Design a binder for this molecule. Structure first.
Ligand code: CHL
Ligand code: CHL
Ligand code: CHL
Ligand code: CHL
Ligand code: CHL
Ligand code: CHL
Ligand code: CHL
Ligand code: CHL
Ligand code: CHL
Ligand SMILES: CC1=C[C@H](O)CC(C)(C)[C@H]1/C=C/C(C)=C/C=C/C(C)=C/C=C/C=C(C)/C=C/C=C(C)/C=C/C1=C(C)C[C@H](O)CC1(C)C
Lengths: 222, 163, 195, 73, 60, 192
């Protein structure tokens, strides 16, 4: 166990040996072992998607703030990419549907039967790419080309992936809510908070605290 | 369905005008600043805000000047009426599954006690509050119990009458 | 022969059948009497589609119009033409001998008592003796169903393409080859209705 | 006359081979034929449904001349 | 048949048909319904016990 | 040899011709898959000999390889060397199919395993073959010489995808401007 999310609370016993476990399950969603395996895989997939997304938002945004490049912001990047895209919208959607149907069915079949996508005849000769590591959510093969899962620091990298994943998930939801509440970019929100942190936060964006629900906002003001 | 938006319906505007006129006719018998005058003014303000909000919500009005709800999930999604029936459907189904799962969990927990009937009329309030808070994650546990086969009692274990 | 979904359990009743990849996710072949009927039905559908696809495609390569442009002389007041040669039959006599010829052939097929000859009759239907060797016949049974399943998807592909774009089969292939990323099933307003 | 269907054979043949309906309609010919109350229930169900159909179709598709103008009728 | 063993009632007209009760005692004098079963629920008469024959109870 | 000195080679790659222990993804772990991949590698390598020798040899004779099939779509006639050459593009694909598919169908009909990779007999004129001492030596020579050939042919396609010009003249630009003209300078291989 990495620790306790609530020090002094009684952590559930089924979360003792999981990587990135702080005993956090107050709703008891992972009490069933099959549910726990499915949610471990789901948390890993969500974590890696949010990881890549937050990288592709923040690193261009930080480079733009430093003045290195001039890329469109994340909430409008779909518009400028589609105008210069050789492939139009509908066929892009269809291709994404086809490719993700294929790869997610392969991932799902490996989840149901571990190592099944690496057996003879599972692919058309290329099943050695996906032999599996025998672990839920850690495929390996082509997905680990540098082979650092065989290194001594494999367990530390599992903990690093999960915690950075939770941070990335919270960061992307923060990006979406900050755009929906303030209308500006994430680095703009950070600079506005750094300029005046008392007055520039969620309590003054006019959205997160609705005026009808909080009548004291318009009363206790200068 | 041949309806018109309430923001451009003449019957909707006529109904707002008539309701405001009736409230203002009631308003003129009281002096300014009195409690009936303030109450009637608050009612007038609420009427104006309600008609403005119903016009701004994209509600469709009939020939009677009254809003009509669209409940087919197709017509609601492609014409912006999902807040009339579809989103309330999702919200109600979530809360109803919450209540049902909390009740089922309390009944199952009380089944294992020495006096199972005692907890049904003398409520274990801390246990009921703990189970009630855990009902937020009801769809995950319920769908897992459905897949596992533990949600349903077997037909051999349920009493039936002779046929 | 393989698995349609690798790494998945296949139904046991499908093991050993010709052209079997364990594909029965709805369990339609669980009843043994139904599975025997479905085997003849798949083969008859396969053989009709294999001749139907070759007839539809092969007439276009000889410049006789597409499969959709064949029968409108019945409704336009025209006359049938086979390779430019006129055919002196009308609809009152084309369908009459169609009912006589086809139902006569189908009545003989339905009268076979044993299960094997209802699928693989042989005899007069195999004059070149391809069923002399058991190894070649077993491999050819897999070849027939895999070609037949491709033709069944092709003919439904003919109907669904024409119901969506209105063009011919080779016309659509030319349209797809001219601009693949902008002319496909996704780029019409039929296959995906909400863009 | 040697031609035609036998209702017992029709009822006995219509059992789904997957066993979804159990034995199917086997023995139902003797059940319907020997029970006058089964026949009366079927006849009354169909006749009452037809009576409702008559009510729903005579108002909307009036079959008699100058009936739609007689509102009381 | 044993003492305090769970049995399933197979009598169709019984209130506790397909239900599980506890054996109180089994009479050995050859009476028609020797197995005495206690149930956790009452029937419509408020009774919690009934007598069953050997074939009417199945050990579970 | 070894593709990565100090790394542990897989055990199933030992004793193979042209073996450097390079299988980090374990593609040839199954012996049935490994046997087919040697025939796939050799046929890919042998076709890469013809592609490179052709592309380079024709332009050493003054005949680009990309501009070679540029008389059918735009308009013109086939030409080989300087002789006016018969046949048309529609007829060329007919002889293309019968010659290659007829030859390739005989490539896999044999029940042997070494003959699918190393035929011998009628396919080895000018002697060669013999017992063991030079057959394995040119077995190693075939895979290694073939390996640059398919790397070069992909390099031929990728360079023309980035520059739009031929490989022989782009070699001349690499000697004229060795530091100002390479794959890093053009804004195709590495953007920004
Ligand atoms: C993660 C998915 C995702 C999200 C959050 C967004 C969000 C956004 N996109 Mg964007 N897009 C996304 C994916 C994609 N988009 C586009 C193409 C565009 C264009 C061309 C444009 C945008 C614009 C926008 C913005 C306008 C608001 C909007 O359109 O809401 C959309 C909100 C969504 C949630 C979309 C649905 C995504 C979906 C959930 C993905 C997964 C679906 C799968 C079928 C999964 C189904 C379940 C599985 C298990 C079977 C907004 C920031 C535009 C904007 O700036 O103009 C006002 C703009 O012009 N997008 C493509 C190309 C195919 C995507 C591929 O997945
Ligand atoms: C969808 C993303 C997602 C999924 C599937 C999981 C799933 C899991 N979590 Mg993770 N988590 C996820 C996102 C996040 N988690 C965490 C923080 C933790 C901790 C600290 C721990 C876990 C643990 C677990 C495991 C056992 C608990 C469980 O059964 O959860 C099942 C969860 C679901 C089925 C998803 C339910 C989502 C629900 C609909 C949310 C709705 C309300 C939300 C509050 C809305 C979000 C608003 C936020 C963004 C402001 C399981 C692997 C515990 C474990 O032992 O380690 C592996 C553990 O100690 N999670 C953060 C940071 C806040 C996230 C972001
Ligand atoms: C969740 C991942 C993710 C998504 C959905 C997007 C989405 C987008 N990016 Mg972003 N990015 C993403 C991650 C990252 N990006 C970037 C860096 C950039 C740059 C510099 C630019 C974009 C641009 C764009 C837009 C134009 C589409 C495009 O890139 O051409 C499609 C490109 C290809 C099809 C070729 C690349 C294929 C790719 C290498 C395949 C990788 C597959 C791997 C297995 C990884 C799979 C990822 C996992 C999570 C599933 C589009 C809105 C452009 C822009 O912002 O607007 C115009 C642009 O200039 N991205 C980094 C580096 C920090 C990421 C990590
Ligand atoms: C990854 C976590 C995260 C970080 C570092 C920030 C950062 C920021 N946000 Mg954002 N947010 C984050 C997640 C989320 N946010 C939001 C919704 C918003 C809104 C609506 C707004 C901000 C704003 C801000 C600014 C701070 C003032 C504020 O209102 O606090 C946000 C208040 C909260 C209650 C959200 C905090 C969520 C966070 C996960 C709490 C946990 C934090 C960790 C314990 C410690 C994190 C340390 C850092 C170094 C990782 C600052 C730039 C404001 C801004 O845009 O202009 C100044 C603003 O108006 N956030 C949601 C949805 C609930 C998130 C999930
Ligand atoms: C009681 C069930 C029920 C009935 C009678 C209808 C009836 C209708 N729907 Mg609705 N729906 C129903 C349940 C549901 N629908 C939908 C989702 C849709 C969509 C997405 C669409 C319809 C459409 C339609 C219309 C034409 C449908 C058709 O067959 O065209 C032949 C028709 C008014 C279409 C439309 O909106 O109006 C033309 C349409 O595009 N329905 C969902 C979500 C899965 C439902 C549950
Ligand atoms: C644990 C609570 C609970 C649950 C999960 C169910 C579940 C069900 N009821 Mg039963 N009921 C429940 C309590 C009660 N029910 C009934 C009387 C009936 C009738 C007469 C019928 C059902 C039917 C049904 C079924 C269809 C759903 C429905 O019709 O809801 C309708 C539910 C009601 C009309 C009563 C609900 C009252 C309340 C909202 C629920 C009770 C809440 C608990 C006190 C919460 C306590 C939890 C705390 C302690 C943690 C479904 C099996 C129907 C059927 O059998 O379908 C096949 C049916 O005809 N219920 C009463 C006496 C009023 C209850 C108290
Ligand atoms: C994939 C192929 C295939 C399909 C889709 C069907 C389909 C069907 N077959 Mg079968 N068959 C098929 C292959 C073959 N069948 C047969 C031979 C037969 C026979 C001999 C019979 C069937 C029958 C049936 C029907 C009932 C089967 C059943 O078990 O019902 C299961 C039904 C239930 C379990 C009850 C469901 C009740 C429902 C829940 C009630 C709901 C009521 C509503 C709530 C109230 C009203 C609401 C309002 C809004 C309407 C069904 C339509 C039977 C039939 O019906 O013929 C027409 C029949 O007699 N098949 C052969 C050999 C020739 C096959 C090869
Ligand atoms: C329509 C153009 C078309 C050409 C050759 C194709 C085809 C090919 N040429 Mg021929 N060429 C064409 C025009 C021309 N070629 C040549 C001169 C040659 C030479 C000298 C060589 C080829 C080679 C090759 C083949 C390399 C792979 C192979 O099959 O070897 C098997 C490749 C198929 C090579 C070859 O055939 O390998 C022995 C080779 O050495 N091309 C000239 C200049 C005279 C052309 C104009
Ligand atoms: C660098 C060029 C090169 C080298 C060193 C070899 C080496 C070898 N080859 Mg490959 N080959 C080479 C280019 C090519 N070969 C082939 C296609 C073949 C065939 C079809 C055969 C060989 C055979 C042989 C062996 C003896 C004949 C020979 O050519 O010796 C130098 C020897 C192992 C023969 C064999 O494998 O063993 C006798 C044999 O049958 N080679 C083609 C396609 C035309 C090439 C271009
Ligand atoms: C081994 C493995 C291991 C691990 O495990 C994984 C991994 C890493 C994945 C792997 C590796 C790999 C590699 C890289 C692959 C690639 C390759 C090659 C390139 C192919 C070719 C391929 C290449 C070859 C065939 C070739 C071809 C050639 C041809 C003939 C050409 C021709 C030409 C010429 C004549 C000239 C003329 O005028 C025209 C033409 C006609 C146009």
């Amino acid at each position: 166990k990495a620790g306790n999310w609530l020090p002094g609370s009684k952590t559930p016993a089924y979360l003792e040996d999981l990587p990135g476990s702080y005993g956090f399950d107050p709703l008891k969603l992972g009490e069933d072992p099959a549910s726990l395996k499915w949610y471990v895989q789901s948390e890993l997939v969500h974590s890696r998607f949010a990881m890549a997304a937050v990288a592709g938002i923040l690193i261009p945004e930080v480079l733009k703030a430093f003045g290195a490049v001039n890329l469109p912001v994340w909430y409008e990047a779909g518009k400028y990419a589609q105008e210069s895209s050789p492939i139009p919208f509908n066929t892009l959607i269809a291709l994404e549907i086809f490719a993700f149907n294929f790869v997610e069915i392969k991932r799902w079949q490996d989840f149901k039967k571990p190592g099944s996508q690496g057996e003879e005849g599972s692919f058309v000769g290329l099943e050695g790419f996906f032999k599996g590591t025998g672990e839920n959510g850690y495929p390996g093969g082509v997905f680990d080309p540098l082979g650092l899962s065989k290194g001594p620091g494999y367990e530390a990298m599992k903990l690093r992936e999960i915690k950075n994943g939770r941070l990335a998930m919270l960061a992307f939801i923060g990006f979406a809510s900050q755009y929906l509440a303030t209308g500006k970019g994430p680095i703009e929100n950070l600079l506005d908070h750094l300029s005046n942190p008392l007055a520039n936060n969620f309590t003054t964006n006019g959205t997160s605290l609705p005026a009808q629900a909080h009548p004291l906002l318009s009363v206790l003001k200068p | 369905s041949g309806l018109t938006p309430c923001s451009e319906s003449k019957g909707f505007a006529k109904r707002q005008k008539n309701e405001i006129k009736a409230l203002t006719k009631r308003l003129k018998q009281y002096e300014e600043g009195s409690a009936p005058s303030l109450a009637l003014k608050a009612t007038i303000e609420r009427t104006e805000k309600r008609f403005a909000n119903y016009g701004n919500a994209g509600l469709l009005c009939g020939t009677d000047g009254l809003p009509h709800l669209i409940s087919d999930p197709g017509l609601a999604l492609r014409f912006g009426h999902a807040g009339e029936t579809l989103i309330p459907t999702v919200g109600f189904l979530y809360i109803a599954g919450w209540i049902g799962t909390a009740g089922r969990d309390y009944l199952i927990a009380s089944k294992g006690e020495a006096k199972p009937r005692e907890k049904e009329y003398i409520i274990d309030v801390p246990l009921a509050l703990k189970i009630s808070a855990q009902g937020a994650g009801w769809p995950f546990r319920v769908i897992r119990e459905l897949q596992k086969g533990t949600l349903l009692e077997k037909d051999s274990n349920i009493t039936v009458s002779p046929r | 022969a393989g698995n349609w979904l690798p790494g998945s359990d296949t139904p046991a009743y499908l093991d050993g059948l010709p052209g079997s990849f364990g594909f029965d996710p709805f369990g339609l072949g669980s009843t043994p009497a139904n599975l025997q009927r479905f085997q003849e039905a798949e083969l008859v559908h396969s053989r009709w589609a294999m001749a139907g696809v070759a007839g539809a495609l092969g007439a276009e390569l000889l410049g006789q119009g597409d499969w959709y442009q064949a029968p409108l002389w019945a409704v336009n007041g025209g006359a049938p033409t086979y390779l430019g040669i006129p055919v002196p039959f009308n609809l009152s006599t084309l369908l009459a001998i169609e009912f006589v010829a086809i139902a006569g052939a189908e009545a003989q097929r339905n009268a076979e008592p044993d299960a094997e000859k209802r699928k693989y009759p042989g005899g007069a239907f195999d004059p070149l003796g391809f069923s002399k060797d058991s190894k070649v016949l077993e491999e050819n049974k897999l070849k027939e169903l895999k070609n037949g399943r491709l033709a069944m998807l092709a003919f439904v592909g003919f109907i669904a393409q024409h119901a969506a774009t209105g063009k011919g089969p080779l016309e659509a292939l030319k349209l797809h080859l001219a601009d693949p990323w902008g002319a496909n099933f996704a780029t019409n307003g039929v296959s995906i209705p909400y863009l | 006359f040697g031609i035609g269907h036998t209702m017992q054979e029709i009822l006995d043949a219509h059992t789904p081979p997957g066993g979804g309906l159990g034995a199917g309609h086997k023995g139902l010919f003797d059940t319907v034929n020997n029970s006058l109350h089964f026949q009366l229930g079927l006849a009354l169900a169909s006749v009452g449904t037809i009576t409702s159909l008559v009510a729903q179709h005579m108002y909307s598709l009036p079959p008699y001349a100058f009936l739609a103008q007689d509102f009381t009728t | 048949r044993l003492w305090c063993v769970q049995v399933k009632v197979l009598r169709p007209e019984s209130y506790w048909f397909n239900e599980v009760g506890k054996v109180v005692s089994v009479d050995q004098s050859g009476i028609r319904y020797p197995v005495v079963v206690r149930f956790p629920t009452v029937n419509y008469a408020g009774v919690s016990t009934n007598n069953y024959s050997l074939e009417e109870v199945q050990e579970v």
